[PDB]
Amino acid sequence: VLSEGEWQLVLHVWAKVEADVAGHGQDIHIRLYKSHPETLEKHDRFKHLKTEAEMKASEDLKKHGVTVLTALGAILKKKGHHEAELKPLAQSHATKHKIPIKYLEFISEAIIHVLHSRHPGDFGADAQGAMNKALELFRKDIAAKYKELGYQG
Numbered sequence: 633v634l635s636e637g638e639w640q641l642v643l644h645v646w647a648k649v650e651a652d653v654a655g656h657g658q659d660i661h662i663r664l665y666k667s668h669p670e671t672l673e674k675h676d677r678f679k680h681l682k683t684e685a686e687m688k689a690s691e692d693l694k695k696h697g698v699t700v701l702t703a704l705g706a707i708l709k710k711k712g713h714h715e716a717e718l719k720p721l722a723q724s725h726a727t728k729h730k731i732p733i734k735y736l737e738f739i740s741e742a743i744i745h746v747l748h749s750r751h752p753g754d755f756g757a758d759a760q761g762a763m764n765k766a767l768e769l770f771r772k773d774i775a776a777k778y779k780e781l782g783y784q785g
């Protein structure tokens with residue numbers, strides 16, 4: 633569970649993501665699909681994209697990244713009070729896209745990597761720790777909402 637100070641550090645580095653949502657989104661997907669090629673199979677409409685440059689050039693992938701990180705930012709900004717924001721996301725990812733919690737772990741790791749790559753100085757151990765705890769809380773709660781919908785992934 634996060635202190636007030638940890639939420640501040642989460643929201644501090646999130647403000648940096650907000651200076652270029654599309655770009656961070658692209659780098660997170662690139663890192664994710666590269667580290668964990670199986671996740672690219674769920675992302676069905678992006679299978680045609682065979683190199684890093686093609687990924688960067690896909691407007692479709694870039695718009696998708698903004699939709700994702702916008703949803704995630706809205707959740708983070710609630711500092712744990714996110715049931716209303718989590719429910720819709722749990723609904724499509726459980727019953728429509730069928731995304732295992734393992735895959736939410738892989739994208740959390742990709743987020744942390746891109747934030748560390750882009751902002752070492754806004755992203756030391758304490759800030760890393762806080763974002764990790766925030767993403768852990770998101771994954772725990774979405775896992776509980778999955779089970780409520782009858783999905784065990």
Ligand code: HEM
Nearest residue numbers: 671674675676677699700703704721724729731735736739
């Ligand atoms: C931080 C974690 C994530 C957030 C906030 C998130 C958010 C979203 C949002 C807001 C949408 C569009 C509306 C919807 O269908 O719900 C979406 C679409 C989708 N998401 Fe996620 N997502 C996350 C992780 C994942 C992971 C790890 C995968 C699979 C590897 C995944 C697969 C999909 C697919 C297949 C779609 C539909 C894409 C399309 O057809 O355009 N998502 N995601």
Ligand SMILES: [Cu+2]
Nearest residue numbers: 648649750751
């Ligand atoms: Cu950044």
Ligand SMILES: [Cu+2]
Nearest residue numbers: 661675696700
């Ligand atoms: Cu995605």
Ligand SMILES: [Cu+2]
Nearest residue numbers: 712713714715
């Ligand atoms: Cu509450």
Ligand SMILES: [Cu+2]
Nearest residue numbers: 745748749752
């Ligand atoms: Cu490093």
Ligand SMILES: [Cu+2]
Nearest residue numbers: 644645753754
């Ligand atoms: Cu700063």
